[PDB]
């Protein structure tokens, strides 16, 4: 580990600087270093980890989609042969993306999830596991596609089960988990009805619990509820 010689607190400090500078690859490397110190992460630190990798993989996914669209067009009737370059470069980006996913999944397996006992941490990490398997599924085309999809499903489902038992329906982690699992259903699992049912039930159960919340908690929850509504509007 290139970050092995840097203090944990310094890695966290620098991750926050990297975020301010929109240097998300650096941010992710600092946070990977912090995880590899072996101590559990605080709430703030978990969110630094997720922001960093979300931004890195988000850029890769966007690039992959551009290149995949170009590649698809190249394989239409009437398209002139341009050689192996589009496929090669799409493959390059794909391999980089898979590498980032494998890095995140590796951190979760060694050893964030096994040490996470509180619902807020455990659900957070299992949601991340589902998310990064979902990103692997987006680019999968081979013999392991079904197993990758099932890995995402299994992680999300464990997170859902804990969240329903241990968290209020307005909890932002619970809401975000449901949002993303709903998208998994729609986009990955070919289950649009399940996606819609989950988003609607999640929204409605949160609505009914808003009365319990402070002004600041209400703002946090209603933000994510609006994302559920946005997806429902897209899908209906």
């Amino acid at each position: 580990g290139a970050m092995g010689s840097m203090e944990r607190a310094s890695l966290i400090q620098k991750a926050k600087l990297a975020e301010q500078a929109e240097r998300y690859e650096d941010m992710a490397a600092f946070m990977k270093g912090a995880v590899e110190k072996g101590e559990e992460l605080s709430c703030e630190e978990r969110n630094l980890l997720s922001v960093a990798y979300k931004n890195v993989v988000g850029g890769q996914r966007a690039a992959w989609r551009v290149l995949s669209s170009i590649e698809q067009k190249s394989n239409e009737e009437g398209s002139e042969e341009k050689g192996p370059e589009v496929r090669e470069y799409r493959e390059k980006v794909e391999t980089e993306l898979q590498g980032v996913c494998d890095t995140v999944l590796g951190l979760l397996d060694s050893h964030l999830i096994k040490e996470a006992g509180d619902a807020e941490s455990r659900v957070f990490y299992l949601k991340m596991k589902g998310d990064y398997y979902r990103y692997l599924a987006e680019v999968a085309t081979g013999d392991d596609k079904k197993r990758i999809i099932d890995s995402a499903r299994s992680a999300y489902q464990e997170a859902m089960d804990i969240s329903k038992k241990e968290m209020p329906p307005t909890n932002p982690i619970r809401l975000g988990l449901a949002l993303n699992f709903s998208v998994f259903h729609y986009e990955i699992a070919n289950s649009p009805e399940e996606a819609i049912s989950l988003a609607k039930t999640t929204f409605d159960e949160a609505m009914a619990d808003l009365h319990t919340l402070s002004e600041d908690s209400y703002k946090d929850s209603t933000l994510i509820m609006q994302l559920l509504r946005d997806n429902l509007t897209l899908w209906t």
Partner: peptide, 5 residues
């Protein structure tokens, strides 16, 4: 693309 967090 749908919203995720």
């Amino acid at each position: 693309f749908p919203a995720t967090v």
